[PDB]
Symmetry: C2
Subunit: 249 residues, 2 copies
């Protein structure tokens, strides 16, 4: 019974909190990372009592260089960590013209820079060990510029490409890289939205099946294949020596 | 008659330097932004002699908060600037496991954070004026995780999405947002498969003058882009958010 320890960012609520509970019941030791230390301690204390696994709590604001460097160091040196859940992330509030220099910095930093750096911290050790799993939490919005969340969607397009690139680089080294792409998730005079428990349960079914790109709210799985095929179809017609004749006078 | 001033980042060499020469010959005043002030001043001096336009040179490291804030201020306050060429960018050196925390920060900052912030600096004024043009320099690598430049390609996937999002948001305000996606561009025992930077920018400016939204000069079959975008929306058309698909149900 040698289950690897799982480090999970954004563990204080929502998708991260559900991942923590899931892996703890499966028998995995945990390292919980979030900005809200109080909700983490409450959740971690309950999971210790129920599942009897060991859980380390790391308070970290991954928009800060000190906090991000501390989590990187934990990922590099803790040889027991064999699973990274790149879950920490934030949304965009308002239109593009309502955004701030501070808001743009934080949104890219948390959704793009931090998960890339955490993946880099583990990839060197994972490759030497010949095993390891990296789960990046993307978003369906990464496919939908029409939704008006331009910067958030752009960071999620980054996350999907990162996952695809890491699989091709690290897959042959024995490393499993999964992209989980939720839609609207629950993390009144209105009914809608998917329960976070259903989302993580679907994501873990793909995880156990070693699925590379997992989109639970996608009804027709073939649509993803056709998108990837269309992507490669475009690349197959790239001729780099000269511009196409439609750009010639 | 009254051609707007163009601010061009990464103007010291390559695509940025070529955009500068092109817009100066058309009659546009320029604001050149780069870290290499010596090479920029050489270029700007030559363009002043040839085209007789005015050129302001701003030495700036767009990975730095102070320098980026100065260029933001210039874009917000200089009402003569009507064109933004988001060209500043750097490549990735080595595999993912060879990357550094320092290298990752700079790669994301220069290729993603800086162009987004510069676009935001102009968009507020552009929207009030009801006109303006934003040209984001992406890359074909944004379509190709197979090329092994994972972080660089990811930033270019970011830039393309940013361009698509800005067109739908700022287009209705009268703002033109173009995505220019080069492949290998030249900025003896092998066959040439790199495009001359002059040919790349000339193709990009033909798309610019035609108000093309996504311009991929090395793409031989233009329909491939349409089919990709259609497939993208086709995937979105099958998104059902209430429950997970039955393939994830026991």
């Amino acid at each position: 019974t040698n289950l690897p320890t799982a480090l999970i960012t954004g563990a204080s609520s929502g998708i991260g909190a559900t991942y923590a509970e899931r892996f703890a019941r499966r028998g995995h030791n945990l390292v919980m990372v979030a900005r809200d230390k109080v909700r983490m301690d409450v959740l971690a204390s309950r999971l210790r009592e129920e599942t009897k696994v060991t859980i380390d709590v790391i308070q970290a604001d991954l928009t800060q260089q000190k906090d991000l460097a501390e989590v990187e160091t934990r990922l590099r040196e803790d040889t027991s960590i064999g699973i990274l859940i790149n879950n920490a992330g934030m949304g965009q509030s308002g239109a593009f013209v309502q955004q701030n220099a501070q808001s743009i910095d934080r949104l890219v930093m948390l959704n793009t820079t931090a998960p890339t750096r955490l993946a880099a911290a583990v990839a060197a050790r994972f490759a030497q060990e010949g095993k390891g799993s990296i789960v990046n939490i993307g978003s369906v919005v990464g496919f939908a510029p029409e939704l008006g969340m331009t910067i958030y969607g752009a960071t999620k397009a980054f996350v999907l490409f990162l996952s695809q690139g890491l699989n091709l680089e690290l897959g042959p080294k024995g490393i499993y890289v999964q992209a989980v792409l939720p839609a609207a998730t629950r993390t009144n005079t209105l009914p809608e939205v998917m329960d976070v428990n259903e989302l993580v349960d679907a994501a873990l079914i793909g995880f156990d099946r070693k699925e590379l790109v997992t989109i639970p709210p996608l009804h027709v799985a073939e649509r993803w294949n056709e998108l990837d095929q269309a992507r490669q179809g475009l690349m197959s017609e790239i001729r780099q020596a000269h511009a196409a004749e439609r750009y010639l006078p």
